[model samples]
Target: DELYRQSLEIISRYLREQATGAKDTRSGATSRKALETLRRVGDGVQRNHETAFQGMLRKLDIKNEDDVKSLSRVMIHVFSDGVTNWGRIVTLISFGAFVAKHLKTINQESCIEPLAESITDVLVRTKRDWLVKQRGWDGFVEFFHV
Candidate 1:
């Protein structure tokens, strides 16, 4: 009973674009305005928090053998402390971008979808009310179009 299908589409496609270093309007997502907004948001977010994000990424046990379920729970830990603000929210997506690059090199690109699904699941579930009050993803685009 999950919502946010289009959100997942934007995120996962954005990540794939990062991983492979190509545009995929063929997927019918990255062609949209929101995806580029995500990029602007993620880039600015990553710049301010590169060190913090690297620290968090290293703590995740990703390797040749690790699977999506394991990594999904690793992402869960980011929210385990509860109530991710938009700042924290932006990093998780950028963090997923970082993960995508690593996975592509490892030949585990297939796992990105499941990982993205898990991301939005907890995002929409745990932060639904908070995000909605702020005007949702649209708010993110406008608030941090930087």
Candidate 2:
């Protein structure tokens, strides 16, 4: 309900942290190694969109594991909507944090692994090569850092 008020550092930070306890997906990119990049990506999202983030979260209507699976569709769907660039990637992670909060709220906390796994799949499929090719984290830190 408070998506717009969600700050980059707070909501985004939570999801990134929740992902850490999750096992690595089949692609095997450890959240531990990638948390630094994700930190900034989350920063980029609400740093750029703090005033509108709640709407981004609220409009999704994602309240459970089933909704969490559909989020996989949003993050890595057929035509690459979530593959634009690092900022869009940031938004997805930021968005997932909203779902993370919702699940954790209603005692579905274990669903975070599914959320994290889908997030991992989203990254591995659509944007990770670009993440590697650009060595994106360096610029991400600079780009989103305060």
Candidate 3:
């Protein structure tokens, strides 16, 4: 859920930036506020990792690729341009990790916000290492691995 929220906020910020960039002299407070809000929410979600992941698992009660992939596409507003880079893909996974490790207070140490720019960073730095390695390039190449 937190992942979903953050993704929305990120996309919102991006749109707002693009719109404002066209005319405004500067983003000034709006952009800074967005960044801080993102940082804090990202941290809060990261701190609630266990609760989030466990809850999602329980609620999902879902199985199979089509189900998961279809749900993800709707949930993340995925587009055809694909996960060629960061932005949507990394933010989604990073927030999910926070949900996974909720019991622990994840902060700058977890590097969640930073990973927004580098999805691999979150995978590697996450407490769960194998999950990261397993979600390698092969995973990205898959239909909706992100």
Report lDDT per candidate: 0.72, 0.57, 0.37
Off by over 4 Å in 1: 1-3, 26-31, 80-83
Please provide, for model 3 over 53-102, each residue's C-alpha lDDT reduced to its tens digit, 9 standing for 90 to 100: 46554564433323333334333333223543433443455444432233
Output candidate 1 Cα RMSD: 2.9
Each prediction's TM-score versus the true structure:
0.81, 0.60, 0.27
Worst 10 residues of 2 by lDDT: 1-10
**Clash pairs for candidate 3:** 46-98, 47-102, 48-102, 49-98, 49-99, 49-100, 49-101, 49-102, 50-100, 50-102
Global lDDT for candidate 1? 0.72
Instruction: Compare candidates 1 and 2 on lDDT and give the better one.
Output: 1
Q: Indicate whether candidate 1 or candidate 2 has the larger TM-score.
A: 1
Q: Relative to the unseen true structure, what is the C-alpha lDDT of residue 105 in candidate 2, on a scale of 0 to 100?
A: 72
Q: Report the Cα lDDT for residue 29, model 1.
A: 33
